[PDB]
Each structure stands twice: as structure tokens, then as C-alpha cells.
């Protein structure tokens, strides 16, 4: 899928070090140039490092590249905030004839204080109920970083089927957001006592239930 | 200065062809290489091939052989994409962007400049207008409280839709969250208002979903 291999994320606190690799062959590193992008949420991808280790204008010193036989490195020094995006490398490919790319690494930069999800459930409503449909609803806010897993059972056993999370998504308040939808049939609603809804946050649960 | 300025957004069906164009200002259209650069959603960067401005050559990547023609129309200084054969997966971003001097024997192989992207949705799915579903106060799931209520916004396609309350004279308190997308090719999404319980039966509380692409309009009264 993807030519140059890339680890999928980094992460640093403000201020720190962080490091992100590319790995190549011979026939493409090993023979050309590496450029750097960083795209940021919504934009193009931006010109980073180009030729190994130069600095288009405008590009802090706190970003340095390097190239070694078959690979490639992205330093960053002195994390900031801004820095929080998709970084990618670039080669071409001489046994392909082609521009290759790095699968992407995304870079969290830890600006902000832990902080657990609150999680609302909401039960099927009667007039989708009438649509003979039943979506149960799972509503996660204000957790810090922006990850969780949402596990959802009916009674106590797990159901997968049915299930559709959203990724998190940066909130205004910098704090992220996030909805998990459980599908059922409304037999399969009224017929337990209770669906509940567990969002994992940092190796911590918070869970809500709810009832026909 | 150089300018590179894209158009072709949209929402096509699988089987159909989509043409994207790239109009190039600030230089020499003629003196540089364009390129062709996907994006599918949430996922990496793809080189689709190169186009010669001045001869109209040009280099497919292996991947789109068969279904991708670029073409140029140097009185215009625009470059074309079109990828025919759609299929769901074709659903990316697509950017033109610079290469190097067409004339130099060793020409530089970054991009530096960039068009702004235009999405390509590509689905099965026909516009369909949203099922509003209101989200009855839940009292006890807002500790502290207050207490959240809230609209679903079910089965729609495709994005986006828009949701006020109070027709935009409620703001406080309310978050609208991202949609989802889910096996039937429909996105869902929900809005929720966090509000002072004493304040449930006073009023209150009314969901205005505006859904453009199917010229459907919603004003969903949330009862306790």
C-alpha cells in the first residue's frame, strides 16, 4: 500500500524530543533524496524538509532531517502545540519509476491535562421505535488525550454487531469528543433488561446503562 | 506568487468519471512538471502520475493505468485529472501539485507548492433525507446536573447537515458531534443540550436540522 514505511503515530509532551522514521530500500532511499511534508488537520501537505536535511523558508530549526543508507529521520526538538499534525516522507522509486510516499505518522503533542470521558447514553426513541428501528446512542465528551475504545453490552454479553464508532474529534475547548451508535432491532431492545455502553480511557472505564 | 487553484468537488457513483482541474498562476505554466497526489480520508498520500505541460506526455502511476487520463490546456495554464470507473475507494482528496523544470536533466523532486484539494466522495448511496429522533432527558447521566437532551439526526446522505436549537437562539450548552458513517452508506450524527433541570418543562427545547443536498428541513420539539 504504501512504498516507505512509517511508524502510524508519536506522541510528546511541550517541549520535548521527538523522533519519526521512514524506512526505505535501495531502490529508493538508497539511491535518492528524502523530503519531509507536514500536513496539518484540513490543509495540503507542506514542505518540510527537502534534500535530506534542508529547511524550506519559514521552517523552525527545532525541525531536522537526516538520511542513512536506507532510511530516514525527522527530528523535533522543542515540541509545541503547532506542531501537532501528519507528518510524511518522500522518495522516488527506481525499480518502480515512480514518486513514492511514507504511510503517514501522526504526532500528538500532549498540551492539555488528562482527564477521564463523560459519557451520556441515550435510549431508542419511541417514534424511531414506531420506524420499527431502535439506535441507541453513546455520547463521549471532554476526555484528554483523544483516545478511547467503547465496548457495548446487552445485559453482560458483548455485542459487536450492530456498532459504529466515530474517530475523536477536537472539541473547542481542546478537549475531544466522540459517538459510539449501537443498532438493534426493537425486539432485541425490549428483549434484555438493560444495553449498556463502556468507554476505556488510559486503561480506565467509565460506563452507562440504560433500560426499555 | 505561484498560485495553484483546484476545482471539481463532488459525490459521484461507483462506474461513473470525475475531472478535476487545477489552474496554475505566477509562473510559466509550461516550465514545470505537474503532478497528480491523492489522499483518501484519514489515510496516506498516493502519487497518481505526472503530466508535461508543454507536450502533453505524460506518466501514469502503475496503480491507475487503466482508468486515469491528464491532459493540459496551456491557454488556460490548467492542468486535468480524470479518473474513470469509479469505485468507493477512489473517495480521496485530490491535489495537483508542482514539480520540477520541465527542461532540467536534474530537476528537484519535492513538492513545494500545492493545490488546495478537492474531495471526491464516491458512494452508491442517493440523496436521502435525515430521520430526526429526539434524545429524551436522561436525568440521571449528567452528574451535577443540569441534564443533557438532544436530537438524532438518522440516515442521511449525503454530507452535510446543520443543527440549531431554539432556531439559533439557544447556543450555550450545545454540542453537536461529528457523523458517522455506517454499513448502509448513511451518515448519522446527534445534537445534545446541556441545561438546568428545573428549566425541562418551562419552555423549550426545539432541534432545527437543515439538510442542503435533499432540501430537507427538520424542527424536531424535544419533550422530557
Known amino acids: 500500500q504504501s512504498v516507505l514505511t512509517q511508524p502510524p503515530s508519536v506522541s510528546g509532551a511541550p517541549g520535548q524530543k521527538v523522533t519519526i522514521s521512514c524506512t526505505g530500500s535501495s531502490s529508493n532511499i538508497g539511491g535518492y533524496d528524502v523530503h519531509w511534508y507536514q500536513q496539518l488537520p484540513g490543509m495540503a501537505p507542506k514542505l518540510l524538509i527537502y534534500?535530506?536535511?534542508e529547511r524550506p523558508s519559514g521552517i523552525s530549526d527545532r525541525f531536522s532531517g537526516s538520511k542513512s543508507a536506507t532510511s530516514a529521520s525527522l527530528a523535533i526538538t522543542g515540541l509545541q502545540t503547532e506542531d501537532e499534525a501528519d507528518y510524511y516522507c518522500?522518495?522516488?522509486?527506481?525499480?518502480?519509476?515512480?514518486?513514492?510516499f511514507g504511510g503517514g505518522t501522526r504526532l500528538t503533542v500532549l498540551g492539555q491535562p488528562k482527564a477521564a470521558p463523560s459519557v451520556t447514553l441515550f435510549p431508542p426513541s419511541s417514534e424511531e421505535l414506531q420506524a420499527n428501528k431502535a439506535t441507541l446512542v453513546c455520547l463521549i465528551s471532554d476526555f484528554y488525550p483523544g483516545a478511547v475504545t467503547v465496548a457495548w453490552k446487552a445485559d453482560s454479553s458483548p455485542v459487536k454487531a450492530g456498532v459504529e464508532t466515530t474517530t475523536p474529534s477536537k472539541q473547542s475547548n481542546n478537549k475531544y469528543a466522540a459517538s459510539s451508535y449501537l443498532s438493534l432491532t426493537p425486539e432485541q431492545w425490549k428483549s434484555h433488561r438493560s444495553y449498556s455502553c463502556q468507554v476505556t480511557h488510559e486503561g480506565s472505564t467509565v460506563e452507562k446503562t440504560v433500560a426499555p | 506568487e505561484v498560485q495553484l487553484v483546484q476545482s471539481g468537488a463532488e459525490v459521484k457513483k461507483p462506474g461513473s468519471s470525475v475531472k478535476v482541474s487545477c489552474k496554475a498562476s505566477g509562473y510559466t505554466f509550461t516550465d514545470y512538471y505537474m503532478h497528480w497526489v491523492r489522499q483518501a480520508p484519514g489515510q496516506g498520500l498516493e502519487w497518481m502520475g505526472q503530466?508535461?505541460?508543454?507536450?502533453?506526455?505524460?506518466n501514469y502511476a502503475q496503480k491507475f493505468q487503466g482508468r486515469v487520463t491528464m491532459t493540459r490546456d496551456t491557454s488556460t495554464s490548467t492542468a486535468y485529472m480524470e479518473l474513470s470507473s469509479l469505485r468507493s475507494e477512489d473517495t480521496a482528496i485530490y491535489y495537483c501539485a508542482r514539480g520540477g523544470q520541465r527542461l532540467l536533466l536534474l530537476r528537484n523532486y519535492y513538492f513545494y507548492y500545492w493545490g488546495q484539494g478537492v474531495l471526491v466522495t464516491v458512494s452508491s448511496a442517493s440523496t436521502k433525507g435525515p430521520s430526526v429522533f429526539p434524545l429524551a432527558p436522561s436525568s440521571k447521566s449528567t452528574s451535577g446536573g443540569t441534564a443533557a437532551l438532544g436530537c438524532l439526526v438518522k440516515d442521511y446522505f449525503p454530507e452535510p447537515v446543520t443543527v440549531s436549537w431554539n432556531s439559533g437562539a439557544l447556543t450555550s450548552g450545545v454540542h453537536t458531534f461529528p457523523a458517522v458513517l455506517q454499513s448502509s452508506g448513511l451518515y448519522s450524527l446527534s445534537s445534545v443540550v446541556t441545561v438546568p433541570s428545573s428549566s425541562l418543562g418551562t419552555q423549550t427545547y426545539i432541534c432545527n436540522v437543515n439538510h442542503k443536498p435533499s432540501n430537507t428541513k427538520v424542527d424536531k420539539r424535544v419533550e422530557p
Open positions: 503530466i508535461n505541460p508543454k507536450t502533453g506526455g505524460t
Open positions: 534534500d535530506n536535511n
Open positions: 518522500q522518495s522516488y522509486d527506481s525499480s518502480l519509476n515512480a514518486w513514492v
